[PDB]
Write a protein that binds this DNA or RNA. Structure first.
Length: 79
DNA sequence: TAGG
């Protein structure tokens, strides 16, 4: 498996760029930006799985990430 | 920064 846990994202990052940024990274598997309209916790972050393990191999090495407008700390994600 |  290969996932990257992005930490600290804008008020609503569009998986679309995340798809480009990370897509351009390589083969993105999926992008899940969790949002709570009931309490809006401080999770304000996004998860990204790569079909491949390269974007993942590099992502984890990247202290911080910048997606279009959003910029969050990506540490290999865990599901 | 932690979804589901």
């Amino acid at each position: 498996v290969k996932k990257i846990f992005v930490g600290g994202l804008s008020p609503d990052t569009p998986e679309e760029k995340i798809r480009e940024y990370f897509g351009g990274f390589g083969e993105v598997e999926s992008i899940e930006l969790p949002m709570d309209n009931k309490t809006n916790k401080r999770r304000g972050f996004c998860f990204i799985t790569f079909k491949e393990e390269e974007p993942v191999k590099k992502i984890m090495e990247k202290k911080y990430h910048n997606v279009g407008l959003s910029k969050c700390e990506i540490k290999v994600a865990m599901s």
